[PDB]
């Protein structure tokens, strides 16, 4: 089943975007999470696009 191999690829994409360092100024980590959200947004677009191919319509 290659839907499974796809899902493992997805998990490897979400894990390539590690959470930010929790220690720091309140708005320093606001900016950290701010940049983290863009990357997670690309990953979400890509992975949702892939997952649609095996489930979709």
């Amino acid at each position, epitope marked *: 089943e290659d*839907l499974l191999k796809a899902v*493992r*690829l997805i998990k*490897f*994409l979400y894990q*390539s975007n590690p959470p930010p360092n929790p220690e720091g100024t309140r708005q320093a980590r606001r900016n950290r999470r701010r940049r983290w959200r863009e990357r997670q947004r690309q990953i979400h677009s890509i992975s949702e*696009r*892939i997952l649609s*191919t095996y489930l979709g319509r």
Partner: antibody
Amino acid sequence: QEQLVESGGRLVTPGTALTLTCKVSGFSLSGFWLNWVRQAPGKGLEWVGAIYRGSGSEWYASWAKGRFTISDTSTTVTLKLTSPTTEDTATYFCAADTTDNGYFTIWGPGTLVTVS
Amino acid sequence: ELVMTQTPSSVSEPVGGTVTIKCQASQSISSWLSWYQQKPGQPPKLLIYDASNLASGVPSRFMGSGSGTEYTLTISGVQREDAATYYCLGGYPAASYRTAFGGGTELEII
């Protein structure tokens, strides 16, 4: 920055396993799609397969599955033809997708393999 | 599984004429089409990506349009260096339809 250079192209009898290597240099990205594309002389482009660098995730076309094995080394990406036939005689390019959006931005110059 | 059928196989045009190449996808690829140019002796190069979007370092005379599964590469002003083979690529490596190339086109300028 981004540059891809492939090697290994030879002339071999059928059934002779053959390893092509793509040395990849100048990439600032953790993962990216590393593709292998094939063109027979005088003919068109044929997508062989692809790998996602950081993972163990390899994908192949319906016609290539099991006859080709893409492997990933720290600086290297190898395409193994396990049982070449005279219809596998072609030029092989490695391509790179940096955006993970599917399009090939960076190509190598290519190599030439003959099978007789 | 994915099959890109590239309708015009050969097209010749006098300079200043508009060439229209069409690719048909065997399945809905949405934004996953990209157009590539190759000239003899050398690897290909990107023209269009995400089906409408001109690549960097490319002249603006190249156009493309997704409509459903019919995708179009439209060159308006042709030039001499436009003599080359053009391909469309579609799909994604991890999609259940794996990425596939069209049959190709040859463009020679008179």
